[PDB]
């Protein structure tokens, strides 16, 4: 059974139970089938992974695992012991069984052991390598829980760039593919952490070394790695030819829950297709518009508002066409500040485009869905403030920002080394 | 009778009732006394100011107004009609009376009309005449309440036209606003670095009363990457005898305003910014869990104040400016010794992030996580760059070798526009 859905696997404030239940509704509404629970800073998932859940947390996880069953989403419970586990100490192993047993009595039946970060001297004696230590404990938790239907394993070398010396010849992956039990699945993020493309030939290459088709943990829409970035563009860079070669695809999307309508809608479109990223974004935006109401009044947002907004917060390696256009046009205006009529005519057209950013922010702050507006607020306010300043500046040619973080970044020479 | 406390007055996600009750608890713990409710994006506070609250919204306001009394915090309800009100039309005035009447039946006794953002040319001779007419009539209609506030459109020095002393607008306001109504003022600027004593006497003369400061010193709603954990600073305690109050508009992240409100509380002793911050940091440390006192000293110095970095922050930046400026040399032992010590200081940022993400107080950590991770990753890159600069006596490789992850290039499309501004 091919797994396709969402992993909540980013850093920072995790989602809340009501947001996750609502996630289960949209996964079901769009015919996806999986949720992987792995919030990096939900303290009992990784930092304090040994602490069992309290009476009140047990009641919230049981309720959340029941909702996943109600909406026919498979619930996968992950745990990340890798930061301070002692693999050779029986009580660490018993604690890891005791804590999965407690989640198992909450209704959960599928699990994952993740090893995404960074070996003690006591385990150098018992285990021949880091890959042997993880595979030993993963296999033993696997068999100890009755060999569950779905059990996932995220390796430490979880992408091409993290493979040493490379994918095909890695000591680490080779031990994993040889000694990890055939029934356990392997997570893989592609050639990179955030893969621009995931080529079929790269998936073939990792499948030989790990001896099975991987489950993609996809970071295409993840935004936890830069405060100013948001990704509302379509699922893209993965050919539908990957589907016969994969055990599943689970996206790790933006931290702000309401901003992942497009990211999950288009992945669902891609899973059912063969696939046009631009057509997928138009179906996702057209459906999304219905959620931007006007408050009922007893005493606004357009489709082109959302097209502009997505083009300004698109994808990690690409801007949408309206974003690249306004940025190409402002480069030309700045560079060329007869030819005089051209400059003013194109400056006039560019201030109008700036006005459309201001107008999209204004109608978005009038919408009835306060949740969507709050999740995206700082991003939309920021792009509006800047374009209001850019617009002023274009007019001028015609007449501490960022904090300490910003001041250090301007002093690095690769500051705008990827600008257009 | 001096009002001092918090205005929740920023843009974006408002606080939830659980955070607000906890704010009242701290206002009381630290001897402050006032809360002004004015979140710009509570749709019924401003955008749809005429719409009554629903049965469930009403019940939430009553419970919260009751908690303010339990904690003896004065609750002031604000409203902003200025974006689309027709001041000269009676039905509009009634709409605003009925809407304040409804909050008044929730237990609320203090109010504010904010004007910080037609056919009225016929009835009113200026915009100040329009607002003061409706402000005075609302004021008396509610029985001249104990506290009634008025935020003018020219609410700071730079917003005054042509200047403070000569503004038609403020002088109309000072002449025609009833003595029982108070006037809000942010100082010489929206975010004032200092609020000089003579500026307050100058503004008090034209508005004919002592102002209540709406203080934006710690607001961070106007820049995504900014957080302000430094002490209340730039206002002499001499202002306390010439002010009717001070209400600070702090960071949008609720847990990040421990220092901002604690230090204002310390200052309300009718004052040393550095000493106030050592009291606030020592107390704040207790709410975590591990995090050390010098961690929070470092953290406050990296997110200090809108016009200043903390001493540990300003130090790492001039030192890295000098290292960058004199890298050509790589006599020469000076540059390497200072590069090692500066690499050591970056470690203290990394170590402060690590213990903060292992701390038991998850609420505080989630409020600041995006800010702490951003500074830690930049300094990790800044440390890498200094290492690269000293490793060049023996390597010709470039700083970035090959194909990068997206976080090597920061800011998205917004960042690309800002780099294009001079």
Swiss-Prot record, chain A:
Binding annotation for a protein: 9, 40, 116-117, 158, 224, 252
Post-translational events: Proteolytically cleaved by caspase-3 during apoptosis. The fragments interact with each other; cleavage does not decrease enzyme activity.
GH84 domain span: 2-273
Active site, renumbered: 117 (proton donor)
Effect of substituting residue 225 to S: Nearly abolishes enzyme activity
Tissue-wise expression: Ubiquitous. Shows highest expression in the brain, placenta and pancreas.
Mutagenesis / variant outcome for changing residue 117 to N: Nearly abolishes enzyme activity
Subunit structure: Monomer. Interacts with CLOCK.
Family, as annotated: Belongs to the glycosyl hydrolase 84 family.
Protein name: Protein O-GlcNAcase
Annotated source species: Homo sapiens (Human)
Parent-protein start and end of this portion: 60 to 701 of 916
């Amino acid at each position: 059974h091919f797994l396709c859905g969402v992993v909540e696997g980013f850093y920072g404030r995790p989602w809340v139970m009501e947001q996750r239940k609502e996630l289960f509704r949209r996964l079901q509404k769009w015919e996806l089938n999986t949720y992987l629970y792995a919030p990096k800073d939900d303290y009992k998932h990784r930092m304090f992974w040994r602490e069992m859940y309290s009476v009140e947390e047990a009641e919230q996880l049981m309720t959340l695992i029941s909702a996943a069953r109600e909406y026919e989403i498979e619930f996968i419970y992950a745990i990340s012991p890798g930061l301070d586990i002692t693999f050779s100490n029986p009580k660490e192993v018993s604690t890891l069984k005791r804590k999965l047993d407690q989640v198992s009595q909450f209704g959960c039946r599928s699990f994952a052991l993740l090893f995404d970060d960074i070996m003690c001297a006591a385990d150098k004696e018992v285990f021949s390598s880091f890959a042997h230590a993880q595979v030993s404990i993963t296999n033993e938790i696997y068999q100890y829980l009755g060999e569950p239907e779905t059990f996932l394993f995220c390796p430490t070398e979880y992408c091409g760039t993290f493979c040493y010396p490379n994918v095909s010849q890695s000591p680490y992956l080779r031990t994993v593919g040889e000694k990890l039990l055939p029934g356990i699945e392997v997570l893989w993020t592609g050639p990179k952490v955030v893969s621009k493309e995931i080529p079929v030939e790269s998936i073939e290459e990792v499948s030989k070394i790990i001896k099975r088709a991987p489950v993609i943990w996809d970071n295409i829409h993840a935004n936890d790695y830069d405060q100013k970035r948001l990704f509302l563009g379509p699922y893209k860079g993965r050919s539908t030819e990957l589907i016969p070669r994969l055990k599943g695809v689970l996206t790790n999307p933006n931290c702000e829950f309401e901003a992942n309508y497009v990211a999950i809608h288009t992945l669902a479109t891609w899973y059912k297709s063969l696939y046009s990223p631009q057509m997928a974004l138009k179906l996702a935006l057209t459906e999304w518009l219905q959620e931007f109401g006007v408050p009922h009044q007893y005493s606004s947002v357009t489709l082109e508002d959302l097209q502009l907004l997505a083009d300004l917060f698109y994808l990690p390696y690409e801007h949408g066409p309206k974003g690249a256009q306004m940025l190409r046009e402002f480069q030309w205006l700045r560079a060329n500040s007869e030819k005089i009529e051209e400059w003013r005519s194109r400056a006039a057209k560019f201030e109008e485009m700036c006005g459309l950013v201001m107008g999209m922010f204004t109608r978005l702050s009038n919408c009835a869905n306060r949740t969507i507006l709050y999740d995206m607020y700082s991003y939309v306010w920021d792009i509006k403030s800047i374009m209001s300043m850019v617009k002023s500046f274009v007019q001028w040619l015609g007449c501490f920002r960022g904090g300490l973080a910003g001041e250090f970044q301007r002093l690095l020479p690769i500051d705008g080394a990827n600008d257009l």
